[PDB]
């Protein structure tokens, strides 16, 4: 097929569309024997040229990559997430769905069909692989064969239209905790709060409303709460009619933080809202309670981080104000009123794609890992050029730079053992070797990243820009 000659489909964004298997990837260093499981990640990767003249990265069909690490080797498997969209377009031999989150640009033949590209997260839970996209139910897949089952509607018990791509697992119960925004239709202010049992049952679905419709991409959990930030990357049917990108950022609107009790029967009046001045924040490191306080650690920037979802008043993109920093939003459930108790910048390092040791989700975490944008580094080819580790107890920061002709994808923490202390284990992440037109899988000792990866695993396929990824042990994915 003939693709557009635009930035979104050329250079590093050239279509790939590869399904493949490789056993025992070539490598340098020592692949830890203690690793026995798989790292899953997803790349948007268009099956077909777009209906319109161009498209954005976030709109490519989900392609799932798995690195099966066992016995000191890494195996590679890559398969399409076969969404209803993928299936319909494959049968038709052409694109049928149009622009990002814009049904007004779809072929009439797919009116009412689920638009998901399943391209934002590759998550393992309850014996299934979840290929996730926040405008639709999640797509479920076999974690071992990587065949596709279909969309998870919980047998029809789910009443909302959508399911998050940023699920959290409650370590106390083992439940998956989820939201679904635009729950009653596009651009609506309805949201569902959901929990899924380890057995796969939808055990709670609570409807509530938020102050305004916006991209509710991420959220936090604590022991007793779901913590939902409301940030004004807004959308509307009018934007779609005016031919605009679905979302745009409004610098004039306030930011809110909603505290939802994680219990049956929660009502709107049970939800508490705090309010602060405008800023941008997308990803959540973690959240926790401490006394009467809630700590909500996010990567906060002064202004919009999505150039493709532009300022609603026409301002050009401000790269400097797009620099995000780990920041603790502190609210006090024992205060009166809506003010935050604190907004505390936690590092001067510019950072995004925050990760923790997920075994400690919703508890106070000593450690965090991030992708860092070090604008002081040489570049010989915004730029994510360092892995960054913060020890929040000691304050110590570690940085590893991938060099001047590379960039990095989201890290993932892998525990050494089920009983290991927080952070005792490894970091895995994809590295884009931009000049060599190829990719590496890097494995680090998670509490000593600054010495560099202990293994560099060569991938003889150029991987595309990725979103979120996750590790599962072999006995959780049918590979033991």
Ligand X SMILES: COc1cc(C=O)ccc1O
Binding site per annotation, positions for Fe cation: 166, 217, 283, 468
In whole angstroms, how close is the CB of 115 to ligand X at the nearest point? Answer: 11
Binding string, 211-230, against ligand X, x = CB under 6 A? Answer: ------x-------------
Instruction: By CB under 6 A, tell whether 249 contacts ligand X.
Output: no
**Euclidean distance between the first and the last CA atom of the chain, given in angstroms as a whole number:** 40
Q: Does 120 bind ligand X (CB under 6 A)?
A: yes
Sheet with 176-181, side-by-side order of all strands? 168-169, 176-181, 190-196, 202-209
List phi, psi (to 5°) of 393: -80, -50
Instruction: Give the residue with the Cβ less far from ligand X, 44 or 453.
Output: 44
Q: Does 119 bind ligand X (CB under 6 A)?
A: yes
Q: Is 58 in the site for ligand X (CB under 6 A)?
A: yes
Report if residue 116 touches ligand X, rule: CB under 6 A. no
Q: Kindly state whether residue 136 participates in binding ligand X, applying the rule CB under 6 A.
A: no
| ∠ CA 263-168-261, rounded to 5° | 20
**Interface mask toward ligand X for 2-41; x: CB under 6 A:** ----------------------------------------
> Least distance in Å: CB of 269 to ligand X?
30
DSSP 120: S
Exposed, middle or buried, 14 (CB in 10 Å: 0-12/13-18/19+)?
A: exposed
Distance (Å, rounded) from C-alpha 224 to C-alpha 322?
32
Give the H or E element holding residue 91: helix 84-92
Specify binding-site residues for Fe(3+).
166, 217, 283, 468
Q: Closest distance between ligand X and the C-beta of residue 425, in Å?
A: 25
Smallest distance from ligand X to CB 119, Å: 5
For ligand X, the binding residues in 438-477 under the rule CB under 6 A are 467
By C-beta, is 227 or 281 nearer to ligand X?
Answer: 281
Distance in Å, CB of 121 to ligand X, minimum: 9
In whole angstroms, the minimum distance from the beta carbon of 120 to ligand X comes to 4
Q: 386 near 377, Cβ under 8 Å?
A: yes
Say how far apart CA 290 and CA 183 lie, in whole Å: 31
DSSP state of 211: S
What the block records as the tokens of 151 is 């969309």
* Count, residues in the chain: 480
Kindly list the residues in this chain that would bind ligand X in the complex (CB under 6 A): 44, 58, 119-120, 217, 467
């Amino acid at each position: 097929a003939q693709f557009p000659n635009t930035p979104s489909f050329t250079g590093f964004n050239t279509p790939s569309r590869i399904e493949a298997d490789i056993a025992d990837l070539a490598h340098e260093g020592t692949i830890p024997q203690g690793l026995n499981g798989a790292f899953y990640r997803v790349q948007p990767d268009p099956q077909f040229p777009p209906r319109l003249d161009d498209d954005i990265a976030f709109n490519g069909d989900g392609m799932i990559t798995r690195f099966h690490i066992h016995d000191g080797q890494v195996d590679f498997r890559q398969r399409w997430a076969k969404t209803d969209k993928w299936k319909l377009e494959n049968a038709a031999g052409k694109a049928l769905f149009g622009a990002y989150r814009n049904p007004l640009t779809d072929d009439e033949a797919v009116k009412g069909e689920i638009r998901s590209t399943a391209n934002t997260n590759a998550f393992v839970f309850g014996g299934k692989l979840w290929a996730m996209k926040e405008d639709s139910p999640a797509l479920v897949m076999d974690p071992a064969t990587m065949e596709t089952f279909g969309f998870e509607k919980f047998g029809g018990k789910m009443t909302g239209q959508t399911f998050t791509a940023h699920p959290k697992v409650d370590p106390k119960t083992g439940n998956m905790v989820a939201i679904g925004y635009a729950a009653s239709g596009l651009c609506t202010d309805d949201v569902t709060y959901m929990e899924v049992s380890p057995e796969g049952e939808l055990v709670r679905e609570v409807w509530f409303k938020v102050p305004y419709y916006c991209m509710m991409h991420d959220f936090g959990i604590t022991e007793d709460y779901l913590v939902l930030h409301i940030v004004p990357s807004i959308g509307s049917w009018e934007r779609l009619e005016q031919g605009k990108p679905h979302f745009g950022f409004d610098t004039t609107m306030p930011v809110h933080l909603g505290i939802i009790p994680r219990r049956d029967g929660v009502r709107q009046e049970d939800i508490r809202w705090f309010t602060r001045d405008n800023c941008f924040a997308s990803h959540v490191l973690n959240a926790w309670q401490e006394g009467t306080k809630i700590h909500f650690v996010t990567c906060e920037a002064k202004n919009n981080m999505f150039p493709f979802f532009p300022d609603v008043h026409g301002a050009p993109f401000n790269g400097m104000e797009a620099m995000s920093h780990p920041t603790d939003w502190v609210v006090d459930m024992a205060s009166n009123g809506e003010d935050f108790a604190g907004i505390v910048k936690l590092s001067d390092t510019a950072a995004e794609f925050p990760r923790i040791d997920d075994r400690f989700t919703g508890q106070k975490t000593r450690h965090g890992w991030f992708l860092e944008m070090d604008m002081k580094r040489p570049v010989e080819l915004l730029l994510m050029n360092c892995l960054f580790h913060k020890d929040f107890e000691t304050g110590r920061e570690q940085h590893w730079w991938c060099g001047p002709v590379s960039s990095l994808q989201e890290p993932c923490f892998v525990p050494r053992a089920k009983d290991a202390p927080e952070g005792d284990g490894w970091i895995v992440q994809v590295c884009n070797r931009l000049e060599e037109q190829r990719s590496d899988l890097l494995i680090f000792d998670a509490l000593d990243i600054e010495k560099g990866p202990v293994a560099t695993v060569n991938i003889p396929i150029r991987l595309r820009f990725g979103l979120h990824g996750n590790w599962a042990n072999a006995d959780e994915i049918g590979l033991a």
